Amino acid sequence: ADDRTLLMAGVSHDLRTPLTRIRLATEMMSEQDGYLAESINKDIEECNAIIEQFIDYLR
Amino acid sequence: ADDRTLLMAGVSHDLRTPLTRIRLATEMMSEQDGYLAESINKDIEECNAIIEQFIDYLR
């Protein structure tokens, strides 16, 4: 009966802004650093997988 | 009487792992890309400021 799911949806919503800016910065990285850009985008995906895990806990 | 603060503390805790890996990747970036590394770390700080805002809402 509480707002835990709305709270989590709000966290996902708000975090999308800086996480998207991190992805955009990686798209300007040097070619030599392509694997650093890949690592950073894997970690953005893991941030989203963590949020999904908390939402799933509340389903 | 609910677990919203513990839920948020858990989100902060879990997100620290991939956000820390993003910081570590930026420390290997090329010198020419220093401002991209700065932008990415500003966005990690904004992720943490967003979580702090949600915890503050629950204080």
Tab-separated table of N, CA and C in Angstrom:
chain	number	residue	atom	x	y	z
A	1	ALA	N	0.820	-1.205	0.000
A	1	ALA	CA	0.000	0.000	0.000
A	1	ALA	C	0.857	1.260	0.000
A	2	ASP	N	2.175	1.081	-0.088
A	2	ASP	CA	3.119	2.189	0.024
A	2	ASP	C	3.769	2.626	-1.307
A	3	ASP	N	4.673	3.595	-1.238
A	3	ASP	CA	5.211	4.192	-2.461
A	3	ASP	C	6.585	3.726	-2.850
A	4	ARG	N	6.948	2.520	-2.468
A	4	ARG	CA	8.291	2.048	-2.738
A	4	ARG	C	8.537	1.877	-4.247
A	5	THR	N	7.503	1.474	-4.993
A	5	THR	CA	7.677	1.229	-6.419
A	5	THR	C	7.776	2.570	-7.125
A	6	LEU	N	6.973	3.526	-6.686
A	6	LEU	CA	7.073	4.878	-7.269
A	6	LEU	C	8.402	5.523	-6.946
A	7	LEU	N	8.912	5.340	-5.727
A	7	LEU	CA	10.239	5.809	-5.345
A	7	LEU	C	11.303	5.234	-6.243
A	8	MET	N	11.289	3.931	-6.500
A	8	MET	CA	12.254	3.286	-7.381
A	8	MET	C	12.102	3.749	-8.810
A	9	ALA	N	10.876	3.926	-9.295
A	9	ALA	CA	10.671	4.421	-10.661
A	9	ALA	C	11.254	5.825	-10.754
A	10	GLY	N	11.159	6.605	-9.693
A	10	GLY	CA	11.710	7.951	-9.660
A	10	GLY	C	13.220	7.973	-9.634
A	11	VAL	N	13.842	7.074	-8.881
A	11	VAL	CA	15.282	6.934	-8.903
A	11	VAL	C	15.722	6.578	-10.308
A	12	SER	N	15.115	5.590	-10.993
A	12	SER	CA	15.504	5.185	-12.336
A	12	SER	C	15.368	6.375	-13.244
A	13	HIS	N	14.253	7.073	-13.155
A	13	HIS	CA	13.998	8.225	-14.007
A	13	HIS	C	15.095	9.266	-13.849
A	14	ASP	N	15.438	9.607	-12.630
A	14	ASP	CA	16.361	10.709	-12.385
A	14	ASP	C	17.765	10.312	-12.763
A	15	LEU	N	18.173	9.090	-12.440
A	15	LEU	CA	19.534	8.621	-12.766
A	15	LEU	C	19.735	8.530	-14.251
A	16	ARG	N	18.702	8.386	-15.045
A	16	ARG	CA	18.887	8.251	-16.492
A	16	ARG	C	19.589	9.485	-17.071
A	17	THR	N	19.393	10.657	-16.478
A	17	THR	CA	20.001	11.883	-17.019
A	17	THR	C	21.546	11.828	-16.903
A	18	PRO	N	22.132	11.713	-15.706
A	18	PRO	CA	23.598	11.635	-15.686
A	18	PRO	C	24.122	10.357	-16.318
A	19	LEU	N	23.437	9.234	-16.285
A	19	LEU	CA	23.974	8.017	-16.909
A	19	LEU	C	24.005	8.200	-18.387
A	20	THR	N	23.038	8.900	-18.959
A	20	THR	CA	23.021	9.152	-20.399
A	20	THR	C	24.176	10.093	-20.729
A	21	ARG	N	24.471	11.095	-19.900
A	21	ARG	CA	25.590	11.971	-20.173
A	21	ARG	C	26.912	11.193	-20.134
A	22	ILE	N	27.039	10.195	-19.307
A	22	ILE	CA	28.240	9.378	-19.260
A	22	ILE	C	28.348	8.619	-20.561
A	23	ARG	N	27.272	8.037	-21.071
A	23	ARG	CA	27.328	7.358	-22.348
A	23	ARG	C	27.747	8.321	-23.440
A	24	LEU	N	27.183	9.512	-23.488
A	24	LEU	CA	27.541	10.482	-24.513
A	24	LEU	C	29.011	10.894	-24.445
A	25	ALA	N	29.564	11.055	-23.258
A	25	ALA	CA	30.978	11.346	-23.149
A	25	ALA	C	31.793	10.200	-23.718
A	26	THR	N	31.400	8.940	-23.481
A	26	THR	CA	32.189	7.844	-24.014
A	26	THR	C	32.183	7.803	-25.508
A	27	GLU	N	31.170	8.378	-26.144
A	27	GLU	CA	31.133	8.359	-27.598
A	27	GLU	C	32.149	9.336	-28.211
A	28	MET	N	32.767	10.196	-27.403
A	28	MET	CA	33.822	11.073	-27.880
A	28	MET	C	35.190	10.604	-27.525
A	29	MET	N	35.284	9.503	-26.797
A	29	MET	CA	36.600	8.984	-26.405
A	29	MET	C	37.451	8.544	-27.591
A	30	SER	N	38.743	8.564	-27.368
A	30	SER	CA	39.687	8.191	-28.401
A	30	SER	C	39.543	6.715	-28.797
A	31	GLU	N	39.945	6.368	-30.023
A	31	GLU	CA	39.766	4.976	-30.487
A	31	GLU	C	40.619	4.035	-29.674
A	32	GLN	N	41.772	4.514	-29.269
A	32	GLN	CA	42.662	3.709	-28.489
A	32	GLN	C	42.015	3.330	-27.176
A	33	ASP	N	41.039	4.114	-26.743
A	33	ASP	CA	40.401	3.869	-25.458
A	33	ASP	C	39.048	3.155	-25.594
A	34	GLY	N	38.805	2.508	-26.716
A	34	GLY	CA	37.519	1.874	-26.965
A	34	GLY	C	37.136	0.893	-25.873
A	35	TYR	N	38.076	0.153	-25.302
A	35	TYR	CA	37.720	-0.816	-24.272
A	35	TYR	C	37.377	-0.123	-22.969
A	36	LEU	N	37.917	1.060	-22.698
A	36	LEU	CA	37.492	1.822	-21.529
A	36	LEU	C	36.074	2.301	-21.737
A	37	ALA	N	35.736	2.737	-22.941
A	37	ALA	CA	34.365	3.148	-23.268
A	37	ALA	C	33.447	1.944	-23.143
A	38	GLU	N	33.862	0.765	-23.552
A	38	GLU	CA	33.012	-0.421	-23.418
A	38	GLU	C	32.814	-0.751	-21.962
A	39	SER	N	33.856	-0.680	-21.147
A	39	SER	CA	33.747	-0.979	-19.717
A	39	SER	C	32.772	-0.035	-19.021
A	40	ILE	N	32.845	1.227	-19.347
A	40	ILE	CA	32.002	2.233	-18.730
A	40	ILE	C	30.573	1.960	-19.132
A	41	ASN	N	30.287	1.620	-20.385
A	41	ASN	CA	28.904	1.338	-20.758
A	41	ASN	C	28.413	0.041	-20.172
A	42	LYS	N	29.257	-0.939	-19.931
A	42	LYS	CA	28.854	-2.160	-19.197
A	42	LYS	C	28.474	-1.769	-17.778
A	43	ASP	N	29.162	-0.830	-17.173
A	43	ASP	CA	28.831	-0.424	-15.809
A	43	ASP	C	27.578	0.434	-15.766
A	44	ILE	N	27.264	1.203	-16.783
A	44	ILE	CA	25.951	1.869	-16.873
A	44	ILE	C	24.862	0.799	-16.934
A	45	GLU	N	25.047	-0.231	-17.726
A	45	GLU	CA	24.065	-1.320	-17.784
A	45	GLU	C	23.923	-2.008	-16.450
A	46	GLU	N	24.975	-2.165	-15.683
A	46	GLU	CA	24.885	-2.792	-14.389
A	46	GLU	C	24.152	-1.851	-13.421
A	47	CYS	N	24.309	-0.540	-13.517
A	47	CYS	CA	23.506	0.366	-12.698
A	47	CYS	C	22.036	0.122	-12.964
A	48	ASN	N	21.659	-0.008	-14.224
A	48	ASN	CA	20.283	-0.262	-14.557
A	48	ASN	C	19.839	-1.635	-14.141
A	49	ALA	N	20.705	-2.634	-14.154
A	49	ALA	CA	20.341	-3.975	-13.718
A	49	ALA	C	20.118	-4.008	-12.185
A	50	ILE	N	20.855	-3.195	-11.443
A	50	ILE	CA	20.697	-3.074	-10.009
A	50	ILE	C	19.331	-2.476	-9.686
A	51	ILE	N	18.984	-1.383	-10.364
A	51	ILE	CA	17.651	-0.785	-10.175
A	51	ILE	C	16.556	-1.776	-10.519
A	52	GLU	N	16.682	-2.512	-11.618
A	52	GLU	CA	15.720	-3.551	-11.972
A	52	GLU	C	15.610	-4.612	-10.902
A	53	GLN	N	16.715	-4.959	-10.254
A	53	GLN	CA	16.653	-5.959	-9.210
A	53	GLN	C	15.803	-5.453	-8.022
A	54	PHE	N	15.973	-4.174	-7.658
A	54	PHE	CA	15.178	-3.577	-6.569
A	54	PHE	C	13.709	-3.441	-6.963
A	55	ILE	N	13.406	-2.985	-8.173
A	55	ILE	CA	12.010	-3.046	-8.620
A	55	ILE	C	11.423	-4.446	-8.616
A	56	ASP	N	12.181	-5.447	-9.039
A	56	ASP	CA	11.682	-6.810	-9.062
A	56	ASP	C	11.358	-7.322	-7.647
A	57	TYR	N	12.145	-6.877	-6.660
A	57	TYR	CA	11.946	-7.193	-5.232
A	57	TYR	C	10.614	-6.653	-4.711
A	58	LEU	N	10.133	-5.600	-5.351
A	58	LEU	CA	8.900	-4.942	-4.962
A	58	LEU	C	7.706	-5.384	-5.787
A	59	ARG	N	7.924	-6.203	-6.816
A	59	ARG	CA	6.809	-6.733	-7.619
A	59	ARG	C	6.083	-7.812	-6.832
B	1	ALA	N	7.272	3.714	9.348
B	1	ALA	CA	7.401	2.370	9.898
B	1	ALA	C	7.871	1.376	8.842
B	2	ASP	N	8.168	1.879	7.645
B	2	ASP	CA	8.511	1.029	6.509
B	2	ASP	C	10.009	1.023	6.130
B	3	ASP	N	10.352	0.303	5.069
B	3	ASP	CA	11.764	0.097	4.741
B	3	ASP	C	12.289	0.945	3.618
B	4	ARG	N	11.708	2.107	3.409
B	4	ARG	CA	12.114	2.930	2.288
B	4	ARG	C	13.556	3.439	2.454
B	5	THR	N	13.967	3.717	3.695
B	5	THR	CA	15.299	4.264	3.923
B	5	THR	C	16.311	3.146	3.746
B	6	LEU	N	15.966	1.960	4.220
B	6	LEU	CA	16.864	0.808	4.009
B	6	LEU	C	16.970	0.451	2.543
B	7	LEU	N	15.867	0.515	1.797
B	7	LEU	CA	15.874	0.314	0.352
B	7	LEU	C	16.798	1.287	-0.332
B	8	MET	N	16.728	2.573	-0.007
B	8	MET	CA	17.599	3.586	-0.588
B	8	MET	C	19.040	3.382	-0.184
B	9	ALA	N	19.304	3.012	1.066
B	9	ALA	CA	20.682	2.752	1.499
B	9	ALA	C	21.221	1.573	0.699
B	10	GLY	N	20.381	0.605	0.383
B	10	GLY	CA	20.779	-0.550	-0.406
B	10	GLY	C	21.054	-0.214	-1.853
B	11	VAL	N	20.244	0.647	-2.456
B	11	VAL	CA	20.512	1.130	-3.793
B	11	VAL	C	21.849	1.842	-3.802
B	12	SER	N	22.145	2.768	-2.870
B	12	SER	CA	23.401	3.502	-2.836
B	12	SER	C	24.523	2.511	-2.713
B	13	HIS	N	24.389	1.562	-1.807
B	13	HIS	CA	25.425	0.567	-1.577
B	13	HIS	C	25.738	-0.192	-2.857
B	14	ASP	N	24.728	-0.666	-3.545
B	14	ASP	CA	24.939	-1.541	-4.692
B	14	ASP	C	25.477	-0.755	-5.860
B	15	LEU	N	24.957	0.445	-6.094
B	15	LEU	CA	25.420	1.280	-7.219
B	15	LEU	C	26.850	1.698	-7.032
B	16	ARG	N	27.368	1.739	-5.829
B	16	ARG	CA	28.748	2.188	-5.628
B	16	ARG	C	29.732	1.291	-6.389
B	17	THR	N	29.411	0.016	-6.571
B	17	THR	CA	30.337	-0.903	-7.251
B	17	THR	C	30.516	-0.501	-8.739
B	18	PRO	N	29.464	-0.480	-9.565
B	18	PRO	CA	29.713	-0.058	-10.949
B	18	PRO	C	30.110	1.405	-11.050
B	19	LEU	N	29.676	2.303	-10.193
B	19	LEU	CA	30.082	3.709	-10.320
B	19	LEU	C	31.537	3.824	-10.024
B	20	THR	N	32.060	3.035	-9.099
B	20	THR	CA	33.487	3.066	-8.781
B	20	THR	C	34.252	2.510	-9.979
B	21	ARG	N	33.761	1.469	-10.651
B	21	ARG	CA	34.449	0.955	-11.817
B	21	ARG	C	34.483	2.005	-12.935
B	22	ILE	N	33.482	2.828	-13.067
B	22	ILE	CA	33.476	3.885	-14.064
B	22	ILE	C	34.553	4.881	-13.706
B	23	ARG	N	34.688	5.275	-12.447
B	23	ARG	CA	35.751	6.177	-12.061
B	23	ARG	C	37.102	5.570	-12.377
B	24	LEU	N	37.323	4.310	-12.056
B	24	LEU	CA	38.600	3.668	-12.333
B	24	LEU	C	38.921	3.615	-13.826
B	25	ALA	N	37.939	3.368	-14.671
B	25	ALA	CA	38.180	3.409	-16.097
B	25	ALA	C	38.606	4.803	-16.516
B	26	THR	N	38.003	5.864	-15.959
B	26	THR	CA	38.400	7.198	-16.372
B	26	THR	C	39.810	7.521	-15.994
B	27	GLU	N	40.355	6.852	-14.986
B	27	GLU	CA	41.726	7.138	-14.594
B	27	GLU	C	42.742	6.568	-15.597
B	28	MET	N	42.300	5.743	-16.545
B	28	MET	CA	43.170	5.253	-17.600
B	28	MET	C	42.986	5.959	-18.898
B	29	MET	N	42.049	6.891	-18.954
B	29	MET	CA	41.808	7.626	-20.202
B	29	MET	C	42.997	8.475	-20.639
B	30	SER	N	43.042	8.723	-21.926
B	30	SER	CA	44.119	9.502	-22.502
B	30	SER	C	44.114	10.947	-21.987
B	31	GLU	N	45.275	11.608	-22.005
B	31	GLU	CA	45.347	12.979	-21.456
B	31	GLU	C	44.515	13.924	-22.286
B	32	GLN	N	44.470	13.667	-23.572
B	32	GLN	CA	43.708	14.498	-24.454
B	32	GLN	C	42.243	14.453	-24.086
B	33	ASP	N	41.829	13.390	-23.413
B	33	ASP	CA	40.423	13.226	-23.072
B	33	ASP	C	40.118	13.607	-21.616
B	34	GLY	N	40.982	14.378	-20.989
B	34	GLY	CA	40.816	14.722	-19.584
B	34	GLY	C	39.467	15.355	-19.298
B	35	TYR	N	38.931	16.176	-20.190
B	35	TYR	CA	37.650	16.816	-19.917
B	35	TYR	C	36.510	15.826	-20.040
B	36	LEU	N	36.641	14.778	-20.845
B	36	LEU	CA	35.629	13.727	-20.870
B	36	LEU	C	35.664	12.971	-19.563
B	37	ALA	N	36.848	12.705	-19.032
B	37	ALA	CA	36.990	12.047	-17.727
B	37	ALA	C	36.403	12.949	-16.655
B	38	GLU	N	36.591	14.249	-16.725
B	38	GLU	CA	36.013	15.149	-15.722
B	38	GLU	C	34.511	15.138	-15.825
B	39	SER	N	33.956	15.165	-17.028
B	39	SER	CA	32.503	15.150	-17.215
B	39	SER	C	31.877	13.886	-16.638
B	40	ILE	N	32.504	12.764	-16.868
B	40	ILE	CA	31.994	11.486	-16.408
B	40	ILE	C	32.032	11.481	-14.899
B	41	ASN	N	33.086	11.974	-14.258
B	41	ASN	CA	33.104	11.983	-12.798
B	41	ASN	C	32.139	12.988	-12.226
B	42	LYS	N	31.840	14.077	-12.901
B	42	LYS	CA	30.771	15.003	-12.463
B	42	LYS	C	29.441	14.269	-12.521
B	43	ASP	N	29.225	13.425	-13.501
B	43	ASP	CA	27.960	12.699	-13.596
B	43	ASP	C	27.881	11.574	-12.578
B	44	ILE	N	28.971	10.961	-12.179
B	44	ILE	CA	28.960	10.029	-11.036
B	44	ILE	C	28.549	10.798	-9.781
B	45	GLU	N	29.091	11.974	-9.568
B	45	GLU	CA	28.694	12.786	-8.412
B	45	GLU	C	27.233	13.153	-8.470
B	46	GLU	N	26.671	13.408	-9.627
B	46	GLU	CA	25.272	13.737	-9.736
B	46	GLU	C	24.434	12.481	-9.455
B	47	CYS	N	24.871	11.288	-9.831
B	47	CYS	CA	24.151	10.077	-9.439
B	47	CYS	C	24.059	10.008	-7.930
B	48	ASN	N	25.153	10.282	-7.240
B	48	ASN	CA	25.141	10.257	-5.801
B	48	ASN	C	24.329	11.378	-5.218
B	49	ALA	N	24.271	12.539	-5.849
B	49	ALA	CA	23.464	13.645	-5.353
B	49	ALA	C	21.955	13.331	-5.507
B	50	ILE	N	21.587	12.592	-6.544
B	50	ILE	CA	20.222	12.166	-6.766
B	50	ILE	C	19.792	11.208	-5.659
B	51	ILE	N	20.631	10.213	-5.372
B	51	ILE	CA	20.334	9.288	-4.265
B	51	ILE	C	20.210	10.035	-2.950
B	52	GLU	N	21.103	10.975	-2.663
B	52	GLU	CA	21.004	11.801	-1.463
B	52	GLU	C	19.710	12.581	-1.417
B	53	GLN	N	19.226	13.052	-2.559
B	53	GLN	CA	17.982	13.791	-2.563
B	53	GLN	C	16.807	12.878	-2.140
B	54	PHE	N	16.800	11.632	-2.635
B	54	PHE	CA	15.754	10.665	-2.258
B	54	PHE	C	15.873	10.260	-0.790
B	55	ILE	N	17.074	9.983	-0.295
B	55	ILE	CA	17.213	9.792	1.154
B	55	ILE	C	16.759	10.983	1.978
B	56	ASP	N	17.069	12.198	1.551
B	56	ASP	CA	16.667	13.380	2.291
B	56	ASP	C	15.135	13.521	2.352
B	57	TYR	N	14.457	13.097	1.279
B	57	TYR	CA	12.984	13.078	1.181
B	57	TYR	C	12.358	12.145	2.218
B	58	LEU	N	13.126	11.150	2.630
B	58	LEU	CA	12.673	10.153	3.583
B	58	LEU	C	13.118	10.446	5.004
B	59	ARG	N	13.943	11.474	5.202
B	59	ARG	CA	14.362	11.865	6.560
B	59	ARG	C	13.214	12.567	7.264
